[PDB]
Structure formats: structure tokens, C-alpha cells
Amino acid sequence: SGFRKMAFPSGKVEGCMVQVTCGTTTLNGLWLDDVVYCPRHVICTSEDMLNPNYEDLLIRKSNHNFLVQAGNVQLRVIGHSMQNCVLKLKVDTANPKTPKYKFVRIQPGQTFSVLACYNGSPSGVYQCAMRPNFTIKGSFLNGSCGSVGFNIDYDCVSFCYMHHMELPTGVHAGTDLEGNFYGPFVDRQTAQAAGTDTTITVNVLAWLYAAVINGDRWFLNRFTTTLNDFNLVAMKYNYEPLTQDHVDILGPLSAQTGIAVLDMCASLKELLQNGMNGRTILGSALLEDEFTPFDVVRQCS
Amino acid sequence: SGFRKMAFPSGKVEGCMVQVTCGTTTLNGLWLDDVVYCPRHVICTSEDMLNPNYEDLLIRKSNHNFLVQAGNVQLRVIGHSMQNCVLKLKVDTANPKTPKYKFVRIQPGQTFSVLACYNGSPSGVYQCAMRPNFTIKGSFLNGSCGSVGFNIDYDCVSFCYMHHMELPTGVHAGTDLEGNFYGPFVDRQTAQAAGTDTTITVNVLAWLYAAVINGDRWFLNRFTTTLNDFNLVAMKYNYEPLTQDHVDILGPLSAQTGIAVLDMCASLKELLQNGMNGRTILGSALLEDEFTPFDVVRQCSGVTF
Ligand SMILES: O=c1[nH]cc(-c2cc(-c3cc(Cl)cc(OCc4ccccc4Cl)c3)c(=O)n(-c3cccnc3)c2)c(=O)[nH]1
């Protein structure tokens, strides 16, 4: 029993974290096989940040301008290339600790674990969700860029996120491991507002099924709703629209608990209308939206 | 910036988890050098479990009644013994991944990371605190027994918790790695219930400091209180008493921030009488108590082990 926000065991990623330094700039890199991936703004100076011209800055660099350190060992850079906003440093020794892995680009609402690192050394691990506005609400200080987000499935690490920047509002922006940013952001210090952060509705419903599953039903009611009527109400609370795809995805949890998705939607509508009235749900006094339908089945069964 | 519930990186512990089987009961073991540590209740049947005699139950067992597997490799048990509620299985192979480590015993209110495992296979890691009633509010399913809790200092794993059982209220009970129970619990299928939990006052104050560090400032007022005055409020709301030691521990945060401890206690005092009712601090509608002062400093300063 119990429900925690659980991250994946971080060991397979720990074995890949290195330190990358260019000039006075030091951040983290991900060392897989004979390639070190890191954010390309490692080649920028503070004087470059407002309008960096990455292609011009990179052409001026030679292999030995890049200092890569794995633990105590210095890795020799034998080549480099840029792919979108990620720099790929070719090194002369493959990481012996390279796990089975793949790069995947995730959708808003998807969860993953973050191994926060500084100077190529892991600081801590937490579980995260890609917000609907393509930011993530992380915990990151200076030096954390190049920390990665990931899921693990059996023994395969799927990398889905690399950290690049903290926006002025305190949230965090980054790329997939092909260097393409999540959301409308750019690796340059210019004004760029994140969209409105909405609540991940399908995730909230999944967590209410998790709450039923663990023996708590005080929030249910006798009502039901149409999909459209639910969305009309929920969007007034800044909830993401719920789609038929979302409804299908909750099907397994509906069957296991005997509660129709549209009935749980009715409970959510009332929860938004009433609040908690002093109670908690799986130990939270708020509606929790960083567990996915898939996560719930994972931790509960 | 930002503030999340952060576990230590689990890599060093992942390399120590193995699967231990005795009959039809299967759970997790901690493999360090040439010894595997696991709950002594792995030798019990469900009939034994009602009132076990462990010294007798163990006398009946023999080295080959213990099937221990590290991934796909089979480990030969070559000797066994009990220390308190922990079984120690001598194997023929030293764990080549054995990290620098020590066995420690923590106190209520201190935090640690749990690596939940199943059939010797790690599945998740999460941060939790030892409650004042010596339970932990973990997330364990069947087969999680033998999972361990730990802290990391530089390169040294401090093992502090081994998981033994789930109480009927859904909370969890375990031992240190020398098999001493945390809390007034016994490893027996019998009627047991934890005492009334309380709230870890020093941890709430530290999290409020974390909030101030992250720009969340509305709960500060201009008043000060005294310990006697605050503790009466604390005692009233099932909050742990606040000691002079706690104040000194929060000293650094009182400097880095400019809010004195009783200053912040006044804020917490005011938060306790009035409330919040759906309004938030650091993304929470309740007062979080599973971050120690050290957790807040370490996270808000980037310590990297
Ligand atoms: O040596 C090093 N130098 C620099 C970094 C570094 C650099 C940035 C950064 C990078 C770019 Cl390309 C643009 C940018 O602009 C922000 C902004 C300002 C105004 C308006 C919009 C925006 Cl977006 C910022 C950063 O965010 N972080 C950081 C800090 C805290 C938490 N997480 C990440 C660290 C480093 O880690 N190491």
C-alpha cells in the first residue's frame, strides 16, 4: 500500500554522466558509446547569450578546446558536430557502462525521472512531468544544464529530456536528445513566455482511480456527464481538455475498479466545485497531475 | 531554482540487491562483500508466522534451504546466522560492486531514500522520513520486503533501514541493518498498530525556509515568539516540541534568509491557527515535514556526492 511519486533507479544513467567544459563554461554531458551529448550553449560566453550565432562559434573551435572529464579520466575529443540544439562530441573511448538505450520524444502529460547533476556528478533524482506548456517544474541550479530525464523499461533507458535553461518564471526548458526543444523556446537569452500552465486532466483521473484502488471513495458521487459537458466545466479551472483517446487510455483502470470514466469525470467536476473540505486524497490536499495512467498501474499492481 | 522531493542517486545500492528464496516465500536481500542480509521472517510459513520461534525455525533450516540469485547468477549459501530480526547468509562470492558503506541507525524526523525492489530487481526510488511514531509512509507491494533505505555522504552509503512489513493502516515498519526494529513492532502476524503520528516541526520550519529561498514569502509577518509560547501551540496541533537544538540546526537558514527561527515559528504558529484551505506554499496545500534542514541546504546548494 501507499502512493509515492517514485523515480526510476538512477544507476544506469549515473554511469553515463560526464563534465564538459569550454572556456569558462562547465556543464554536464551524457556519454553513450563514443559520443558525449551536451547542450550547445556550452560554446557560448556571457557576451554571446543575447544573440548567439552557434554555427559561427562552432566553426572556430578545435577538438581540444573541449575538456571532457569522466570522473578522474579526461576523455579525448576526436570530433564534434551539432544537431539542432545538442552538441555531439566524438571521443576516442566508448563508455564501458553504456546501457541499452534509445532516444524518445515525449508528449505533454508524460512523466519521467530527472538525475540532477553538477560537474558531471549526480546530486539527486526526482520524478517529473512534461507540463502542457512544454516546460517542466524542476529543481535546478546553475551548472545543471545537460542533466537528463529518462524512463527505464525492463533494462532499456529511454532518454527523453536534456536540461538547457531556467526561464524567468522559475520553470525549466530543454530538448529531446536529438536537440529539438520542447515547446516554443530557444537557447538564447531573449524574452520567451511559456503558455498558460494547465492541469493534466487525464493524469488527475488516473490518480483518482489510484485513490479508489487504495481503498478511498469519499469523493465519488451518483452523477455522470457527457464528455463535452465535462470539458466545458473543467476548462474553466484551467484543466486540459479530455479527449476520447484519454478516455480509451483510462479503460483498464475503469474496468479494474468498476467505475466508468465519465462517472469519475463527474467526481472530478464536483471535486473542483467543492475542494477537499479538509480531507486528503493519497496524502495530498490538492488534485495531483504528475501520475500517468501507466504509472498508476505500475505502482499499484 | 525549484524544490522537489529528491532521493539520493541509487546506483551504488542497485548493485547490491539480490533475490532470496526460502520455500514459497521470496523477497529481497542486500549483498555486501560475502554476506547477504534479509529479513529473518523469510524462513517462516504462514503457519509459522502466527507465533514463530525463529531460533528453532532456523535450526531446522540448512544452507541449501536458501536460494539466493544475483540477476541470473546463482549464489551458493555456505553459512547462515541471525542478528536480531535480520538473517545473514554467508555466500561463496564477494559482491564485486560492494560500495563503501556503513550500517547506521537514524532517529525519527531524519530522512532517507528507499530503493523498492521485487525479486531482487529494483523498480523505483523515493525519499521518505522516519515518522515520530517510527513508521514510514512508503509505497510497497508484496515482495518488497528486504528493500533498503539509505543516505549517501560523499562516496559512502549509510544503510539505515530494511523493510519487513506493512501495518494494517498501510504504513510500513522495518529494522536497521543490525535487525533492531524501529518502533514498538515485532516480526509476527499479529495485531499491531502504530501510535498517533505527529508532525516533524523542525522539518516544516526548514521547508518554509526553502519556500522563502524560492520566492514564496507571503506567510512572513513582523512578529517574534518564544519556544514556550510556540510549543504550547505545537503540542495542541500534534506537532513535535521544538528544542534549542532544532534552532541551532536552522541557524544557517536563518542567516541565508534573514528570518529568525522564532520569527519563522511565529509564521508557522499563525499558519497553524488560521490555515490555508487550498492556498499553497511551494506547490503544496499542506505543511510538508519530510525535508530536514540539511536536505534543504543540500538541495538549494547543489551537493553532488
Ligand atoms: O558555465 C555555465 N554557464 C551558464 C549555465 C546556465 C545557462 C542558462 C541559460 C542558457 C541559455 Cl542558452 C539562455 C538562458 O536564458 C535565460 C533567460 C533569461 C531572460 C529571459 C529568458 C531566458 Cl530563457 C539561460 C541557464 O538557464 N542555467 C540554469 C540556471 C539555473 C537552473 N537551470 C539552468 C545555467 C551553466 O549551467 N553553466
CB atoms B124 and A284 under 8 Å? no
Nearest beta carbon to residue A6 from set B1, B139, B214: B139
* Ligand 1 centroid to residue B67 C-alpha, Å: 52
Cβ < 6 Å from ligand 1: which residues? A 25-27, 41, 49, 140-145, 165-168, 187-189, 191-192
CB atoms B123 and A9 under 8 Å? yes
Q: Which residue has the cell 560492494?
A: B98
Angle (CA) A55-A120-A111 rounded to 5° is 85
* Ligand 1 centroid to residue A63 C-alpha, Å: 24
User: In angstroms, rounded to a whole number, what is the distance separating the alpha carbons of residues B186 and B84?
Assistant: 11
CB atoms A139 and B166 under 8 Å? no
Q: Which residue has the cell 541550479?
A: A141
**CA dihedral over B173, B176, B179, B181, signed as positive or negative:** negative
CB atoms B2 and A123 under 8 Å? no
Q: Which amino acid is at B185?
A: F
Choose from A6, A114, A197, A207 for mutation: most chain B CBs within 10 A: A6
Q: How distant, in Å, are the alpha carbons of B2, B206, B223 from that of A290?
A: 16, 25, 37
Question: Is B127 within 8 Å of B5 (Cβ atoms)?
Answer: yes
Bridging pattern class, strands B77-83 and B86-91 = antiparallel
**CA dihedral over A300, B3, B6, B9, signed as positive or negative:** positive
Please report residues of B whose CB lies closer than 8 A to that of A124: 6-9, 299
User: Is B64 marked active-site?
Assistant: no
Point out the ligand 1 atom lying closest to the alpha carbon of residue A187.
12
User: In angstroms, rounded to a whole number, what is the distance separating the alpha carbons of residues B16 and B252?
Assistant: 36
Q: For A124, list phi and psi in degrees, rounded to 5.
A: 180, 170
CB atoms B139 and A3 under 8 Å? yes
Experimental approach:
X-ray
Closest CA to B234 of B182, B181, B207, B273: B273
Question: Is B15 within 8 Å of B159 (Cβ atoms)?
Answer: no
Please report residues of B whose CB lies closer than 8 A to that of A122: 9, 11, 304-305
> What fold characterizes domain B201-300?
main proteinase (3clpro) structure, domain 3 (1.10.1840)
Nearest-neighbour CA in chain B from A56: distance (Å): 31
Question: Is B265 within 8 Å of B287 (Cβ atoms)?
Answer: no
Angle (CA) A270-A271-A276 rounded to 5° is 135
List A80's β-bridge partners, or say none: A89
Closest CA to A177 of A116, A88, A108: A88
Nearest beta carbon to residue A275 from set B15, B115, B278: B278
**Cβ neighbours for B99, distance < 8 A, ≥ 6 positions apart:** B12, B13, B15, B16, B155, B156, B157
User: In angstroms, rounded to a whole number, what is the distance separating the alpha carbons of residues B304 and B213?
Assistant: 20
Nearest beta carbon to residue A141 from set B8, B116, B302: B302
B203, containing H or E segment: helix B201-213
DSSP string of A144-205, one letter each residue: -TT-EEEEEETTEEEEEEEEEEE-TTS-EEEE-TTSPBSSS--SSSS--PPPPPPB-HHHHH
Give the experimental resolution in Å: 2.2
Bridging pattern class, strands B172-175 and B25-32 = unpaired
Superfamily of domain A11-91: Trypsin-like serine proteases (2.40.10.10)
A69, containing H or E segment: strand A66-70
User: In angstroms, rounded to a whole number, what is the distance separating the alpha carbons of residues B69 and B29?
Assistant: 9
Please report residues of B whose CB lies closer than 8 A to that of A285: 278, 284-286
Point out the ligand 1 atom lying closest to the alpha carbon of residue A39.
12
Residues of A acting as catalytic residues = 41, 145
Please report residues of B whose CB lies closer than 8 A to that of A283: 137
**A266 class by beta-carbon count within 10 Å (0-12 exposed, 13-18 middle, 19+ buried):** buried
Eight-state DSSP code of residue B289: -
Question: Is B132 within 8 Å of B240 (Cβ atoms)?
Answer: yes
Cell triple for residue A113? 525521472
